[PDB]
Amino acid sequence: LKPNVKEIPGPKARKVIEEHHKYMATTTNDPNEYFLVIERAEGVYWIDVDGNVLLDFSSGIGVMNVGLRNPKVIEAIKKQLDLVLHAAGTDYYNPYQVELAKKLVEIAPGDIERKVFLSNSGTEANEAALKIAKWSTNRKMFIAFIGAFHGRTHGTMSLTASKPVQRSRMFPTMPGVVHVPYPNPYRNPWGIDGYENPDELINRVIDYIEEYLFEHYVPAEEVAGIFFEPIQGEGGYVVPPKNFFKELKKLADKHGILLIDDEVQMGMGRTGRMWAIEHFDIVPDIVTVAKALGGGIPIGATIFRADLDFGVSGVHSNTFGGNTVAAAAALAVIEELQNGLIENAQKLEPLFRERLEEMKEKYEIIGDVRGLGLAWGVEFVKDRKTKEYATKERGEIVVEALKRGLALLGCGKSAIRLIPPLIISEEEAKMGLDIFEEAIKVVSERHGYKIH
Amino acid sequence: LKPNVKEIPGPKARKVIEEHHKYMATTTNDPNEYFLVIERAEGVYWIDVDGNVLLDFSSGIGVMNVGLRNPKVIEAIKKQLDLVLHAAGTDYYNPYQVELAKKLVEIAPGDIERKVFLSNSGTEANEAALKIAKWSTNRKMFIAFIGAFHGRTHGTMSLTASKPVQRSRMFPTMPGVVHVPYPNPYRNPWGIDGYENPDELINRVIDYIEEYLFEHYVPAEEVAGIFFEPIQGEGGYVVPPKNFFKELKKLADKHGILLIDDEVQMGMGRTGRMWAIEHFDIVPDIVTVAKALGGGIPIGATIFRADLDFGVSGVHSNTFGGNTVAAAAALAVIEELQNGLIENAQKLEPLFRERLEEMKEKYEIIGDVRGLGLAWGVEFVKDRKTKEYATKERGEIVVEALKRGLALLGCGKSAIRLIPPLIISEEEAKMGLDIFEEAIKVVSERHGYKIH
Amino acid sequence: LKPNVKEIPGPKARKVIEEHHKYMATTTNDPNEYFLVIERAEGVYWIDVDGNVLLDFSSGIGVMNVGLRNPKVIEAIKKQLDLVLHAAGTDYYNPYQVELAKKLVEIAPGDIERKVFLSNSGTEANEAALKIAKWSTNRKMFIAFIGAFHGRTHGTMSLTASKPVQRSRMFPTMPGVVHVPYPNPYRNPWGIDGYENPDELINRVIDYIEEYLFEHYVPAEEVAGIFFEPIQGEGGYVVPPKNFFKELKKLADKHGILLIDDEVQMGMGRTGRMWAIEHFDIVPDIVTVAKALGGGIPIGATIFRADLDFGVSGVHSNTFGGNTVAAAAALAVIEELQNGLIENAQKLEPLFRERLEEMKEKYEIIGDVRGLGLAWGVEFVKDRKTKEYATKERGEIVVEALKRGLALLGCGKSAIRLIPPLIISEEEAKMGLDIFEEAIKVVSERHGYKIH
Amino acid sequence: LKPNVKEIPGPKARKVIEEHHKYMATTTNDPNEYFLVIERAEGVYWIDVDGNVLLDFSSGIGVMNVGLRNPKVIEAIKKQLDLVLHAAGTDYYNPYQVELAKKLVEIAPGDIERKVFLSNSGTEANEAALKIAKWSTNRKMFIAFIGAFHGRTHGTMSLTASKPVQRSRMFPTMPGVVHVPYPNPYRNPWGIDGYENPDELINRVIDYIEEYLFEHYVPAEEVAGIFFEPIQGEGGYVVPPKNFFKELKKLADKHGILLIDDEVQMGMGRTGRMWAIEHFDIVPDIVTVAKALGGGIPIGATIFRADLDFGVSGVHSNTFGGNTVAAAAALAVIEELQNGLIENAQKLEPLFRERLEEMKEKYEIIGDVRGLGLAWGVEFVKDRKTKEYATKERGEIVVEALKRGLALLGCGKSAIRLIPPLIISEEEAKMGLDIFEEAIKVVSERHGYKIH
Numbered sequence A, B, C, D: 001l002k003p004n005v006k007e008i009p010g011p012k013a014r015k016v017i018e019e020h021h022k023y024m025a026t027t028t029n030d031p032n033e034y035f036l037v038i039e040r041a042e043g044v045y046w047i048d049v050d051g052n053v054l055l056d057f058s059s060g061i062g063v064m065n066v067g068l069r070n071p072k073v074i075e076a077i078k079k080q081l082d083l084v085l086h087a088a089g090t091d092y093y094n095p096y097q098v099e100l101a102k103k104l105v106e107i108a109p110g111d112i113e114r115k116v117f118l119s120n121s122g123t124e125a126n127e128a129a130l131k132i133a134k135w136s137t138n139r140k141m142f143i144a145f146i147g148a149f150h151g152r153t154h155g156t157m158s159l160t161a162s163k164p165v166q167r168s169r170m171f172p173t174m175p176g177v178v179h180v181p182y183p184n185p186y187r188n189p190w191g192i193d194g195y196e197n198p199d200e201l202i203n204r205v206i207d208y209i210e211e212y213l214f215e216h217y218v219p220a221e222e223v224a225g226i227f228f229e230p231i232q233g234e235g236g237y238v239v240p241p242k243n244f245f246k247e248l249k250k251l252a253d254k255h256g257i258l259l260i261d262d263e264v265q266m267g268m269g270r271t272g273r274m275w276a277i278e279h280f281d282i283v284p285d286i287v288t289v290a291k292a293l294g295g296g297i298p299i300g301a302t303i304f305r306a307d308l309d310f311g312v313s314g315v316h317s318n319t320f321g322g323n324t325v326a327a328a329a330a331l332a333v334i335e336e337l338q339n340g341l342i343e344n345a346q347k348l349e350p351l352f353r354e355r356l357e358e359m360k361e362k363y364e365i366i367g368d369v370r371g372l373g374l375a376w377g378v379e380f381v382k383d384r385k386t387k388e389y390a391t392k393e394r395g396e397i398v399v400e401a402l403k404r405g406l407a408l409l410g411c412g413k414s415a416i417r418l419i420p421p422l423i424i425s426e427e428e429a430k431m432g433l434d435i436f437e438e439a440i441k442v443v444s445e446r447h448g449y450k451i452h
């Protein structure tokens, strides 16, 4: 199996795309932009409906970090289909979910007292995390960061501030969320070159929260929780300065406010550590996780400081959570991660770092490259000084990449996210990076961007 | 397999129950009322970790309608595991999510243009129904029923109204929900015997909404929707009057207000019909479903009039939506309902109708029996005139039923829900009712309730 | 002065009514129901711009309790105009605001520690009661009564529940208000004759709050207050059962919930007692007042248990609060109430009780008469059994009353409020009732209502 | 009458301050900081209870712009006491309120179609302005600026973001308000010297709204209204760059969003023009006004684009609004303003400008002076580079000023506002400025601030 795409969209793929519009809601699908109709997968390759074969650099939106069809994960589901699928894990008990909870507690950030709530997705996780914070603190408000994307349900909508379309005629969602600039070292309201000047940018963010919220309109003692992603994912895959969460805890702790680390995307080994937050050297009180945890099965988890746990029964619960198939799959994923995959993403870090700083130098359309492990984001600006978003160009590059057999996804207004399965070999990476470049190169020539 | 219980909880179950309290959040588990620790299942029975075997009348909180381990479903899954698990349905198209989506619209109540938004759970369904209701109507408010349960996320909790604990310390949740008395024929504020006088109670519930909301504090034309359960799942299995939803649509259409019907529990032919609402001869604008459709797999589904689809991309989306594994399970589950299982639930309806009216005639502790198909709800009262809840007694029956090999669920303050798998045989249905009557009989004697 | 009307509206009034529609916002003026253009006043009568003279039974919407132009009040003002008008009471202290504040606590219902927050109006009073309730209890929610009116600011409108138009296009207003049926003896959802069966109706209204809010969707211990009018001013002058507020305090104390009584209309001895609540033998934690206390001057006053005072400075404040001109008028107004005017309203109560029961016996259009002191409310019904509002007819009576020299106010959908100044003589009280009966009689004949 | 204070607080003033604490709510009073107990006034002098005489530089918190006891204003109230005090100006009509409305429309900013709503205070005005905006646009959200102070009621609380104490345990207030930095040329999150670099600062504010709200979490088409004060008053009396509202309209108009100019403090001639906004060369759609409009009587007005008016009756109204005494007083104030006072504040502008830039040069404790007409704010910083607030020093200066006979008020965290009556002579000003300096001088020596 090598990349091989004779034509796309194919007659079969064209018929699915017609049908999908007949019977399915307008979500985030894009007929022209993302005409990829998957029928099966193998290793790091999607096999489409018309037979075209594409190297994967999307990993099912980060859902698959172990691979697109992990053997150990399908054996674990098969083995768990034999005993029990569902055991109402919130009314009755079952050991599988307890085995997962104990494992999740174990691998949590830091070395502190933890408990675990189970969910079916990242939005449910972050909904959980909200209630848990509301209950334990008896405070009702929350800080999130502009660019953050925590979900699409009425709690997480409030928290999510990536695209105003997300909240189109949704107002009002859950009250008490206030937003401040994320320390985005490429776009922040201060013009600050956050790579050259990280402490200057860290300070401006903190100084905003302290001086322009707490001192004016936000009672600091009324804030349950600060919600952050350790790398904004949907927000264009943004890496904030190394010493940012350390400075943020300092300010959190000074007003007895919870830190909530949304690792729905950047967790499960993606950045060459179990959790994204470790690189930033802080122990979050609540850690939410989903996507990659279920290795292709729907699963969500909320990991928290044990003393934050719900006083009484019937505050929160869910029928679906605690499903055995998902828990069987999860334990297996975490085993795959600990036994090779997490080391592999640290191994391929310097390869994506060199090859993308190569592309930075050469293609003037690229404004910024950034990432950790196998979590990368290239943002494409029309003009480097102006930093205007090349949204149209980004779409063209993805389409071009798809034509050449590379599967990519667009995060943010003007960037593309490289997130292959953590199983990818050195020879499968160089292939993706080679294809990716050739996509930029074509679209660069097409529009008269310099090529140094 | 037969029912076969020695010590429950046995020594392995006691160890699991301990481990659960240590690692896992405080939810709706009860070591003292629901001490059932499930290792595996076959046919209609649970096998616990000590090897005790119990007849199922809980059906995993109405999720295993097709059986606790259906052969058709597990084969449909394992076939799909050979192809692909997750395929980024929100961003990329696959045929499986389309087939399921297409299938769902076809089986939907009435005969009108429908589309479908795939979700991960009941709450993730009703959350979606909210946003569809909001976006389509460009109205922000909803009506809901006291006694209703629609999920535990910041949207749905405004909608939910079963127990205050559910909303404890959560305010504010989503604004704009106003609630009103569900036409419970047994408990309503007007005292009305709703079984005897079903029109009088319908008028009252309607009179309230028109005269007390619409004429005083709730602008009719600013209401985006009315969420109702056709039978309240966590409300004690309250069955409304047959002409209720008819009267409620007369009112709804008069002000352009969408009627949303929640079938997360009573759906998938639980009541002897594919959709619970069908018994009531009305067509809802939205239908939400989860639980049973997945058939042991987490699944979500919001079915709506094509008119209400979001005009633009990026209003609502989800990473796990349209799971191919889940879609494969769902289609298999649907076939079984149409090819035997729905018929079997019409067939066994009279048995329960008989045996549970035999039980009310005999045991004074039983205030009201009610149900359709294989959805039954016995409510237990201290006195038949004052109707004080027999909460302590209801919990004892559940514990007694369990020491005699019957998995039962509480539902409401003082009632028990009988919801066996729709694959249950006549002989297995009698066996479980026998054991159910015995558990009432024990707890009746113990407390000196009358036995006629 | 006598009543004396020729053309109303006369040619100067028509010119003013035109100028008003041109320069001024669309509020609660009605050229077609309230075409009364006031130039000056003396004693108990209005003189209009054409020199038509009308007997007053409106009392400036219950503001001129002491008369339309009281000598004592105007002297108290002009004496204060010689000293100072505004003195920055919020920031600087003056003796006048303290004297009035001290005076207000002394006259307050019951005998407990009280303080006072001076405001500018009824809404600015109840807004204050909210913040005092919130700050003191550290609870965010309130209960209120369907039919209630408490003002038209973003706090109070949640509290208010008289007409939807009041809340049209305003959502969201302040969250956390839940409403319930006021124990109207004439119109309630249970049908109960509350005059006949006042306990049955009290139980119902109480049963609703306990069983339908506190037991299902409203955590009792998260309710900061219950706002009630002792008689609903814009609700058609509905007089609740005498033992109602007693039962409601039993419940309120059981959950630590402040009972707030609004006397913005029924206060200042309107009902023959200084405070309207007094008739009901309970002591409210907060008492709000405005209108009549000012005596032709804008004034606001929130009276509360000393326990609930804000711990810190800068939570609540207002620039115009504690106006010295207004305080001088208020003290003068209070003296009159205690030195003649409250007595005069007890004295004239039987007259209205007679004449309006004589009118109900005679005119079939009259569904219900009700009132205390000099607060009377006739409600007009199409039919006495169906109780459909006689809205069109009620408006005609007001117009007929006015062509015969009687200023009257609508109140509720189909009723009229009789609220003359408390300086009204027995002879002036008979005259206005005679004219009132005549206006009913005309509109009865015109529409073929029965005359017994 | 000259400044003359032998001792303060006096034995009489000490007794009032004791009593005030017995019977009055904790608001913004400060026993130690503002021990000024007014008994009467004359010209520009307060006469305290113990006989001490103080030149006024507070003007009753900006309430008196015509003087502390204007003759023309007391003659107008006296003349209006004779005819009518209250005439329920929202139910019935009266020419006085129409005469005021017509006058207010006339003197409004720009030359456009206007209507007028009447209120009792600035909070009611801004509550009005909210509803009017909500109704006309059918949008529910609003932008205000950090530092803004629009009121203390549940709508205006949301809008007000000056001190977090203001919102202490108040959450939730009205949803949908979002806040952005005010272009404060001395403190903004960008460090921008707004006097040297106004366009750079204007852009950063606009660029924040456009790029960090509209493009991320705030749908621009869902924003009814941008609320601004043309000089932040309570926020330390801050003058934003001359071309700021012009750039803000540009952005407003591009998304069909209303501009709401809160002139409650800076209006009624205070800045040497009728309205503060004129200096900034834009025509606001809604203009709110109170305080100075009533010349010592409680009055509020909301002036708006006529096509924004309430479609239907009963959306908004108030019992108090339209009071004749206040309207009589208002017309008189506006006459005083147009016939000398507004020219006088333009005359004394260069005198406060020179004498305060004198004080800037000499006293290192002064960080910034700023203002227009007779609206001035001196902010005192501990260190000029650091800009730390000298809150304690500010209190000392006010107390010191009070001791020497000068009446001042503290606006913001570390500044004092000079706002004498517009009637003040050149010789009464130099006196105030002389006293003010001597207060700074003393406190400067006391603490070892340089004196150049």
Ligand SMILES: Cc1ncc(COP(=O)(O)O)c(CN[C@@H](CCC(=O)O)C(=O)O)c1O
Pocket (backbone or CB within 6 Å): A028, A061, A062, A120, A121, A122, A123, A124, A126, A149, A150, A151, A152, A229, A233, A234, A262, A264, A265, A290, A291, B090, B317, B318, B319, B320
């Ligand atoms: C922080 C965060 N929260 C929630 C989710 C997904 O919530 P679910 O509960 O699984 O529905 C994601 C996935 N990030 C995706 C989200 C795409 C979308 O929701 O449209 C991304 O890569 O943008 C996420 O990164």
Ligand SMILES: Cc1ncc(COP(=O)(O)O)c(CN[C@@H](CCC(=O)O)C(=O)O)c1O
Pocket (backbone or CB within 6 Å): A316, A317, A318, A319, A320, B028, B061, B120, B121, B122, B123, B124, B126, B149, B150, B151, B152, B229, B233, B234, B262, B263, B264, B265, B290, B291
């Ligand atoms: C109407 C409705 N909505 C939502 C849900 C659950 O949403 P999920 O997304 O599947 O979690 C249920 C299940 N009713 C269960 C609820 C159990 C609980 O949450 O405590 C019941 O029958 O008690 C339901 O009946």
Ligand SMILES: Cc1ncc(COP(=O)(O)O)c(CN[C@@H](CCC(=O)O)C(=O)O)c1O
Pocket (backbone or CB within 6 Å): C028, C061, C120, C121, C122, C123, C124, C126, C149, C150, C151, C152, C229, C233, C234, C262, C263, C264, C265, C290, C291, D316, D317, D318, D319, D320
């Ligand atoms: C309980 C209550 N609160 C507040 C108010 C009015 O607050 P203000 O601040 O004095 O405006 C009223 C007056 N009831 C009037 C209301 C008129 C109206 O606003 O339309 C009435 O009798 O209709 C009232 O009864």
Ligand SMILES: Cc1ncc(COP(=O)(O)O)c(CN[C@@H](CCC(=O)O)C(=O)O)c1O
Pocket (backbone or CB within 6 Å): C090, C317, C318, C319, C320, D028, D061, D062, D120, D121, D122, D123, D124, D126, D149, D150, D151, D152, D229, D233, D234, D262, D264, D265, D290, D291
């Ligand atoms: C913008 C604005 N809104 C409202 C008000 C006052 O609202 P009322 O309706 O009159 O109560 C003021 C007065 N500015 C004063 C406010 C002081 C205070 O409210 O504590 C000031 O100078 O700080 C104001 O400047």
